[PDB]
Design a protein around this ligand. Structure first.
Ligand SMILES: CCCCCCCCO[C@@H]1O[C@H](CO)[C@@H](O)[C@H](O)[C@H]1O
Ligand SMILES: CCCCCCCCO[C@@H]1O[C@H](CO)[C@@H](O)[C@H](O)[C@H]1O
Ligand SMILES: CN[C@H]1CC[C@@H](c2ccc(Cl)c(Cl)c2)c2ccccc21
Ligand code: NA
Ligand code: NA
Length: 504
């Protein structure tokens, strides 16, 4: 079995998976909407009671599986719980990263496309008033993606967007096809320092932003002034749990698969805690210092509430590109911003497609070359639904990348800490640990952690599912039909794997 060559490479790869566009866009928006500086209270608590324990558990499950030659959840769940229902539950944890990759790589390709367009100077050049500056960039983005102009739910991406997606897939493949150590690990050792350098440069350039509407210091102020009254709203506590859960990338299956290449007695406690900490640092220090302060510096603290409510996507793909074009060398600054977003996405997507590759290698005995190429073919083909059908991305992101991950995260907890055995799980976590998990976390993992995920799951289900099922366009059923088909497809591959094993 492949293994990580160095501890540093392992940590940077895991951190690279966790650190993405969300660090620079989703977190600042969430904090600004949920109490500002006060949001750090439930955020730290959720990090300690949910993020950290679940992360150690996913690492533990992966390393446990890898020692027996299995990197994905269909086999791993069965090893933990030898039951037919376990193999079926395990399919979910292979279905999720497969479905997520189908839309994620496309989103990632947008950042490469925009980086190129900013670099060469092919961007709108306004003109005054905020709507006169934002609109040309809204149209710029809409034309690239092919946002519907009529009543039809059809997307028409530009030729450039489509070619860049091809290039983006090729880049993912070029890394993945070289494997864990010479591919993913080697890239992580370059991309992470680069990501750090770009971020620091952006923080510095943002802090120097001075407009008649305000400064960056006003942005840091608006973002980091505590509003303790919001701590009464349960939604703020729910948002913090969700923020921690998603930013760490728990429940997606990538962590488990990456951990499956950690040697049997190699540390995961300190390594996992370090990777998690790197994500948080990149999130609150780097992410919190770029996007929001820039938006507030340019549009004033008066529009600060409106900006955060506009969302992470609008902030990163419309508002920020617009602001840069109004500054000296902002064309190059926009390039750096999207270059940053591209590497942040690329480090995550190579981690996100590895589970499918691992399944083909471990369970169907495909060579790395064949496993990578077939995984790429499936993702590339399937992405055409995301590229051409309006809201297909949103539907995939909800079922797999939102509801699915929280459900699967809870399933992981139960199967590992309740079914497999709490004592065994604990020993599987701490074995080879450079530091030991504090004894108190045994109770947290067994009772507190699954309680938080259960509350998150139920609240989001009751809040979002009825709307999703009753207020959406009929075309969402195309996406539902297809991804249900993908689940049936993986179930069939698992069937073929076990029938091959019985033969050999
Ligand atoms: C959900 C997956 C849909 C697959 C993408 C559909 C391919 C789109 O093919 C369409 O062919 C038309 C021919 O008249 C052309 O005019 C359009 O430009 C082209 O996009
Ligand atoms: C989700 C899948 C949607 C794919 C978009 C398909 C592109 C539209 O293809 C359609 O082909 C028709 C051929 O009879 C033409 O007459 C239409 O005007 C053209 O829009
Ligand atoms: C998990 N938070 C980020 C990190 C990884 C990144 C991600 C997760 C799984 C996969 Cl399969 C891929 Cl390709 C990419 C991602 C996707 C959707 C939503 C959020 C996120
Ligand atoms: Na993150
Ligand atoms: Na990443």
């Amino acid at each position: 079995r492949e293994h990580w060559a160095t501890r540093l490479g392992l940590i940077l790869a895991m951190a690279g998976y966790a650190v993405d566009l969300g660090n620079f866009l989703r977190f600042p928006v969430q904090a600004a909407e949920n109490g500002g500086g006060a949001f750090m209270i439930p955020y730290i608590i959720a990090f300690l009671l949910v993020g950290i324990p679940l992360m150690w558990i996913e690492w533990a499950m992966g390393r446990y599986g890898g020692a027996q030659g299995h990197g994905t959840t269909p086999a791993i769940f069965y090893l933990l719980w030898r039951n037919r229902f376990a193999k079926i539950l395990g399919v979910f944890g292979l279905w999720i990263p497969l479905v997520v990759a189908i839309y994620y790589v496309y989103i990632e390709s947008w950042t490469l496309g925009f980086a190129i367009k900013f670099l060469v100077g092919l961007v709108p050049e306004p003109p005054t008033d905020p709507d006169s500056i934002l609109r040309p960039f809204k149209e710029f983005l809409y034309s690239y993606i092919g946002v519907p102009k009529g009543d039809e739910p059809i997307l028409k991406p530009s030729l450039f967007a489509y070619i860049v997606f091809l290039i983006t897939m090729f880049i993912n493949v070029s890394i993945l096809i070289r494997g864990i150590s010479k591919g993913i690990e080697r890239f992580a050792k370059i991309a992470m320092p680069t990501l750090f350098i770009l971020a620091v440069f952006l923080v510095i350039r943002v802090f120097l932003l001075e407009t008649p509407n305000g400064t960056a210091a006003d942005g840091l102020n608006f973002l980091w002034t505590p509003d303790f009254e919001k701590l009464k709203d349960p939604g703020v506590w729910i948002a913090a749990v969700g923020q921690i859960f998603f930013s760490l990338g728990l429940g997606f299956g990538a962590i488990i698969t990456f951990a499956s290449y950690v040697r049997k007695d190699q540390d995961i406690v300190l390594s996992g805690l370090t990777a998690a900490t790197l994500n948080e640092k990149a999130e609150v220090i780097l992410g919190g210092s770029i996007s929001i302060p820039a938006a507030v510096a340019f549009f004033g603290v008066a529009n600060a509430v409106a900006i955060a409510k506009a969302g992470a996507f609008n902030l990163g793909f419309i508002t920020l590109p617009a602001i840069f074009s109004q500054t000296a060398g902002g064309t190059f600054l926009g390039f750096l911003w999207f270059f940053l977003l591209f590497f942040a996405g690329l480090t995550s997507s190579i981690a996100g497609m590895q589970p499918m590759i691992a399944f083909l290698e471990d369970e169907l005995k495909l060579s790395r070359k064949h496993a990578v190429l077939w995984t790429a073919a499936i993702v590339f083909f399937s992405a055409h639904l995301v590229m051409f059908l309006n809201k297909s991305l949103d539907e995939m992101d909800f079922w797999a990348g939102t509801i699915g991950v929280v459900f699967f995260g809870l399933t992981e907890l139960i199967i590992f800490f309740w079914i497999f055995g709490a004592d065994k799980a604990w020993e599987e976590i701490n074995r080879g640990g450079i530091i030991k998990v504090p004894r108190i976390y045994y109770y947290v993992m067994r009772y507190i952690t699954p309680a938080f995920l259960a509350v998150l799951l139920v609240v989001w289900a009751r809040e979002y599912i009825p709307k999703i099922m009753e207020e959406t366009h009929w075309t969402v059923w195309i996406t539902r039909f297809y991804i249900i088909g993908l689940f049936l497809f993986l179930t069939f591959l698992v069937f073929l794997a076990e029938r091959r094993r019985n033969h050999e």
